Amino acid sequence: GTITSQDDNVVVGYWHNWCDGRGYQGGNAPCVELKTVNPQYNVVNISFMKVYDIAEGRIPTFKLDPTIALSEAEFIAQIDTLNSQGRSVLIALGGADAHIELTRGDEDALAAEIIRLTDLYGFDGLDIDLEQAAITAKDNQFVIPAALKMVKEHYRKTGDNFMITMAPEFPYLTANGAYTPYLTELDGYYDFINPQFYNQGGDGLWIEGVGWIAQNNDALKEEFIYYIADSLINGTRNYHKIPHDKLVFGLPSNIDAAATGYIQDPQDLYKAFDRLKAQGQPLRGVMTWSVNWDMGTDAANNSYNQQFIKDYGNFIHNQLPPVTDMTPTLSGIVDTRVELDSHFDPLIGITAKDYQGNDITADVTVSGSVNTNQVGDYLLTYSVSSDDETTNQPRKITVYVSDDDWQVGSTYVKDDKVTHNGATWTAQWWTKGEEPGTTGEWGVWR
Ligand code: NA
Numbered sequence: 001g002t003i004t005s006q007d008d009n010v011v012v013g014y015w016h017n018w019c020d021g022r023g024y025q026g027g028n029a030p031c032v033e034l035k036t037v038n039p040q041y042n043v044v045n046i047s048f049m050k051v052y053d054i055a056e057g058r059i060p061t062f063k064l065d066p067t068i069a070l071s072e073a074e075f076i077a078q079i080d081t082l083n084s085q086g087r088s089v090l091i092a093l094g095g096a097d098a099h100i101e102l103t104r105g106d107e108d109a110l111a112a113e114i115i116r117l118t119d120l121y122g123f124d125g126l127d128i129d130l131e132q133a134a135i136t137a138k139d140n141q142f143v144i145p146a147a148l149k150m151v152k153e154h155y156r157k158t159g160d161n162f163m164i165t166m167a168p169e170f171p172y173l174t175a176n177g178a179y180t181p182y183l184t185e186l187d188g189y190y191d192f193i194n195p196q197f198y199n200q201g202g203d204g205l206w207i208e209g210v211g212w213i214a215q216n217n218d219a220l221k222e223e224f225i226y227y228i229a230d231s232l233i234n235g236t237r238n239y240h241k242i243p244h245d246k247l248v249f250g251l252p253s254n255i256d257a258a259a260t261g262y263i264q265d266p267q268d269l270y271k272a273f274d275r276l277k278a279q280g281q282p283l284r285g286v287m288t289w290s291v292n293w294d295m296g297t298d299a300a301n302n303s304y305n306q307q308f309i310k311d312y313g314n315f316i317h318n319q320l321p322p323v324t325d326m327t328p329t330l331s332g333i334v335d336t337r338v339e340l341d342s343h344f345d346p347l348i349g350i351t352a353k354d355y356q357g358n359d360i361t362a363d364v365t366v367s368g369s370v371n372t373n374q375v376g377d378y379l380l381t382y383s384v385s386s387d388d389e390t391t392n393q394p395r396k397i398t399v400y401v402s403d404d405d406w407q408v409g410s411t412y413v414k415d416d417k418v419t420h421n422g423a424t425w426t427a428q429w430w431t432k433g434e435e436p437g438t439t440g441e442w443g444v445w446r
Helices: 072-084 107-121 140-158 180-185 221-234 266-278 307-317
Strands: 010-016 043-049 088-095 125-130 163-166 204-207 211-214 248-252 285-289 329-331 336-339 351-353 365-367 376-386 389-400
Touching: 010 248, 010 307, 043 125, 072 088, 072 107, 088 107, 088 163, 107 140, 125 140, 140 180, 204 221, 211 221, 221 266, 266 307, 285 307, 329 389
Parallel strands: 010 043, 010 285, 043 088, 088 125, 125 163, 248 285, 336 389
Antiparallel strands: 204 211, 329 351, 365 376, 376 389
16 A cells, blocks of 8 residues: 555554453453554554564564454555555554664665565554663664664655654653654654653652652643643753654553553543643644553453543544644753863854754854853853744853963962963963963063
């Protein structure tokens, strides 16, 4: 099939390529045919592309579990069905026990395999759902991005939009965080991120006024959803900036489906979306583990009568067409220290991308100066415009006084370099209280 890109808000559902999956409270996730997946999940993610046995090498692949009771011809046509209905089928790279340990160079193999599997099942793109171990493992943080980047271009030539999604667990999203490589490298290439806001129980964030909100807390679930969201969509509270148009809220479908992080009351999520909506940053949809557990049954053989999707689906669909955050991006801006009378180039280190990936570093302006000559703290503001939008972002420069600065009492020796009234005077012999500049043409100081 051809690549069907999802372009409106999305509900996202993982599909088990296994049967009788056991839950955290002894439920069952029966397998199910694609075409049984509730039609309001307009993004189904086939789970999982991995390495089935090491004797096929490091490059992972996908094979339908015989037990599922589906011909690969059927499977393929069920995808063509969803595709035609406007929905989208994705291959999720990873899961547990995926043994995904790529070394540098494997890019081309991964890419080619991706492209093969895609052209065969009519998949519409990939979901990076690496387990913990596999985020850092060997060269993953290089290979995987590299691969997909190539893949995306392959399809860009034809005119097709290979969908890229990721599914980091939220703690990994803290700027300077494992997934930074992925997000940074794949910027403009990824369609939208669907973090897992589950299974990191105690983890969370501190909000001024509210205190310590954690994912394991169901009294403050409204907060959690609202705050982590706001942080991510704004790059605040030590979190990477995922645009709002590209953020999707990853949730258990129910209690069997995860240890922690299932929302008891939807209102919580509803309010948070209306909140984030109110502030001008509506989210792109929700995501769950999994349609199978939603279609599943609990430890009492009671059906979870596909609740989540009932909970969330009109909710999300009745929302409004996404609007693209074409703001550009400014990386490099980190508050720095500079030595008195030292040299400082503002535009060193600074890069700027647009919304689609393109580097606009050139078009970066700077407002402010940093008078190294005088001690103090100086405030630059960087600014770049593209696609009719501007991003501005402050930067603080503190001027340190340094050892070298000439002190009266300080005994300097021959060849010593000090500083005074804006200069780096050299001594020519022992000295102790001769102000550089009061000497002469042939003075202690030079
Ligand atoms: Na397709």
